[PDB]
A = this chain, B = another copy of it.
Amino acid sequence: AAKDVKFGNDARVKMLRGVNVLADAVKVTLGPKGRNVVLDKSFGAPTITKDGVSVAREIELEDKFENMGAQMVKEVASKANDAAGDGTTTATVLAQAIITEGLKAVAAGMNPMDLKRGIDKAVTAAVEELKALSVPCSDSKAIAQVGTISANSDETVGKLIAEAMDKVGKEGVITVEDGTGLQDELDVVEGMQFDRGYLSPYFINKPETGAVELESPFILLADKKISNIREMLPVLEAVAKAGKPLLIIAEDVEGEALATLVVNTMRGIVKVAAVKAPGFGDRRKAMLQDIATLTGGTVISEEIGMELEKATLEDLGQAKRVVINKDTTTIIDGVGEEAAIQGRVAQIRQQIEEATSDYDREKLQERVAKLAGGVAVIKVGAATEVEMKEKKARVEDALHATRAAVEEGVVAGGGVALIRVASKLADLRGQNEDQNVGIKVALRAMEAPLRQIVLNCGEEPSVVANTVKGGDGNYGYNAATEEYGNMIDMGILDPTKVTRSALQYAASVAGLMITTECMVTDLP
């Protein structure tokens, strides 16, 4: 359709007004004293949230140029949530401050391209200084503090996430889901815990629990679906000769074969039980082979060539314990070679590195946590649905912050890290004066997270920013108690990945936005 075209300072003012609207919506949540934002949902109750990415996503303005500004600065929070999962509010606070100060220098006649080059140089040096300033975060108390701070100073969430990471180890996978109670519940599972139940209700060895218990059972892995008892009849006879129980992981055991095997189960000759193979095509085979590696067995398939008729006891897998139930199944201490397990771990890690999709990579990480280590599920307990959503978002942010802490390290929180970085970058210079001014607006905008935290606390941002800049090291401002001290000692830690990602994405988008002169939108 027809277009409205704005040029120069008019377009810059409209875009900055949109950025200010989005950033003022976002930044009322920053810090521990930050407040919540209600987002109207056309389907369901409104969402009360303290995370900046949701309130950034929900912002869309009537003025098309202001809507441009809002969308472009919303990209900052979207990217910061995609990469680190935390610091979206900090990223938007940084992006707004670079844009306002960058447009001040743009209105001062300085070249926006050179300003963007200066911002990029300053933020590259800032990332280097953050990496130098960072301390690795491996101990449990530091992780608990990171999870607490990232969850609006909720010590319960931080300690629960610290315990979960301690339980599942470094290779473990932790996810957050809703709970039925009012309290946070941690559910840690070990070994293979694929979510398929028994094909028939009659396998139950323990009727008082509905769970089949198999002590040191054999494990058959059929990559094909079976409906006749003929094929594994030699295997069934060999198992009956051995006398140990047998568990089948197959694509489908149904009809005739299933009926005869449950009949043989209640006859007592074989304590057999069959369950469906997990996943779907191109994924079922890989983690079926993972189960085989864990249990020291081999998968029976037509592609690999051997049939169930020539399958023997050596072909079948081995574990010390097997638990069947309605929804899932647990295999405890599969008898497999350790070196093969680590080789499979390395292979799936290489697949993770080669994976360019979040879904495939997260499935591979889940498989790694299944075969090695454990899986933790955090049930968010809340009296109401809106508190469930708010607490779930906070726990997710805390989990992402703990993951970023172990990935890259921690720095002093509350924006003190960016303050120290900007203080260290005082002598950085560009190629010309416009680049130096861009560096200076980048350094000044690194004070924006601390200033906005103090503004949310109700104190004076200038006084506290100058006081923190006067101090050295991790000395900073406790925004909850409104005091001063070594931010590490008071447990206010920020993930280096979160702060660095927020700074980088804010700098990139903000430089691209201050470089603009003309904006072309649709007419109202």
A residues with a Cβ closer than 8 A to B are 1-3, 5, 7, 11, 15, 21, 24-25, 28-29, 32-40, 42, 45-46, 48, 55, 58-62, 64, 67-68, 71-72, 74-76, 79, 109, 111-113, 152, 180, 182, 200-202, 207-210, 258-259, 262-263, 266, 285, 302-305, 326, 343, 346-347, 350-351, 354, 356, 382-387, 390, 458, 504-505, 507-509, 512-513, 515-523
Contacts and interface: CB of A to CB of B under 8 A. Distances in A.
Given A59-B5, A207-B347, A347-B210, A37 B519 contact: yes
A61 B24 CA distance: 27
Contact of A38 (B25, B68, B111, B303): B68
A9 to B, nearest CB: 12
Contacts of A1: 60
20 contacts: A2-B60, A2-B67, A5-B25, A33-B111, A35-B113, A36-B512, A37-B517, A38-B72, A39-B519, A39-B520, A40-B521, A45-B72, A48-B516, A55-B520, A79-B385, A210-B351, A259-B303, A259-B305, A383-B508, A384-B505
Contacts of A36: 112, 512, 515-517
B516 A37 contact: yes
A262 B386 contact: no
B208 A346 contact: yes
Nearest to A35: B517
Contact of A79 (B72, B112, B383): B383
A350 B211 CA distance: 12
Nearest to A201: B285
Nearest to A66: B2
Given A7-B28, A520-B38, A2 B62 contact: yes
B38 A518 contact: yes
A58 B2 CA distance: 9
Nearest to A33: B111
A40 B25 contact: no
Given A1-B60, A350-B210, A386-B512, A35 B520 contact: no
A45 B71 contact: yes
B285 A458 contact: no
A208 B75 CA distance: 38
Contacts of A520: 25, 37-40, 55, 58-59
A372 to B, nearest CB: 17
A390 B523 contact: no
A43 to B, nearest CB: 11
Contacts of A33: 111, 113
A257 B45 CA distance: 57
A343 to B, nearest CB: 7
A29 B520 CA distance: 14
Given A60-B1, A61-B2, A48 B285 contact: no
Given A28-B517, A29-B517, A48-B512, 12 more contacts: A2-B60, A45-B75, A48-B513, A55-B518, A202-B304, A208-B350, A209-B350, A210-B354, A262-B305, A266-B305, A382-B508, A383-B508
Contacts of A512: 36, 48, 384, 386-387, 390
Closest 10 CB pairs of A and B: A35-B517, A40-B521, A263-B305, A383-B508, A2-B62, A38-B519, A37-B518, A36-B515, A28-B517, A387-B508
